[PDB]
Paper text:
The structure of the apo form of KDO1 was determined without iron in the active site, lost during purification, while KDO5 retained the iron throughout. While a ferrous ion is present in the KDO5 apo structure, it is not the case in KDO1 apo as the metal is lost during the purification from the KDO1 preparation used to grow the crystals. After crystal soaking with FeSO4 the two His residues (178 and 314) and Glu180 in the KDO1 active site recapture an iron. Among all CSL dioxygenases whose crystal structures have been reported so far, this is the first time such a loop motion is observed. Its motion seems to be induced by α-KG binding as this loop is closed in apo and complexed forms with products and lysine, but opened when α-KG is bound.
We have focused our work on the iron(II)/α-KetoAcid-dependent Oxygenases (αKAOs), a mechanistically diverse superfamily of enzymes that use dioxygen as the oxidant to catalyze several reactions via C-H bond activation, mostly hydroxylation. These enzymes operate with three substrates, dioxygen, α-ketoglutarate (α-KG) and a primary substrate. One of these, KDO1, catalyzes the formation of (3S)-3-hydroxy-L-lysine, while five others, KDO2 to KDO6, promote the formation of (4R)-4-hydroxy-L-lysine.
Numbering used by the authors: 30 to 358
Amino acid sequence: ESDPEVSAILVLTSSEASTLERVADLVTAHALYAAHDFCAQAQLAAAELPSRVVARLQEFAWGDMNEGHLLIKGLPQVRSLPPTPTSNVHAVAATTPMSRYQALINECVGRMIAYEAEGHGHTFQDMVPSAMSAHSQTSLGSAVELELHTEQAFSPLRPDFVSLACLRGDPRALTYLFSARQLVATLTTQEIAMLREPMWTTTVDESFLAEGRTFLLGFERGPIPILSGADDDPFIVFDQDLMRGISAPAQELQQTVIRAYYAERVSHCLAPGEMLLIDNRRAVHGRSIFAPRFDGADRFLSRSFIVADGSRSRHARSSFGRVVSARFS
């Protein structure tokens, strides 16, 4: 029954939540139609947040031994929440007061970014159940478990962080988290060395494909390792559906990672007023089966992405643009 610990939990006091609510009034631009102005206003207004909150976010952003995630509780209550949309085309979360609270916290950590090939390049995406993709390996699934993965395993432009703010929760929908440090603690020396070898080719996610769309990096990339970086602070790239072992031992090692994940993963049921930051280099994430009703009261998260460095994607964006063009993913 492992859950996110006190070190990986930031609880806002009533006073801190009130400051955050007032500071959100400094963020006035349209999140979808003036994304850069919106994000830059949030980055500047974030200087007005409580110092204790800013300190925890900057520590998490630095990354060194950060646990892989940070759960924030006590965000100001979403009071006039519209019904949960049945698809992600409406971008309902992007005009809620939560989008401003989420942007302020995000912009303490790093620069918000979006991807043309992911949820229409929306600054905030509605993470809601899809009746079509219910049995699919996507953030809109429900009837099947969302398998352990890092976000955009195939892409060098993958986000540094995934930001999930909860508008409506579902009691059966558990978010699973598993860090590269937790993984390495269960493995033998030989398994760690092998995961550090470039033995996995990676393929572009099927949802990124489109008629007449060509990727500069091609459809199949690598081979790449699963583990990299410092021995005591390893980075992870993992996705069974998009990473193919170049040999039978390479395929067996992904099974080793999956078993360690089922044995050691921590869980948390996201509730309204909560926000989860996942370090996409240090942890993998998943989600349990749940049973949505598609009745306007379903689980509803606002998803956004963060990168430490916006210059890394400049070649893939327009001037004062926050959207990475699909061909560069």
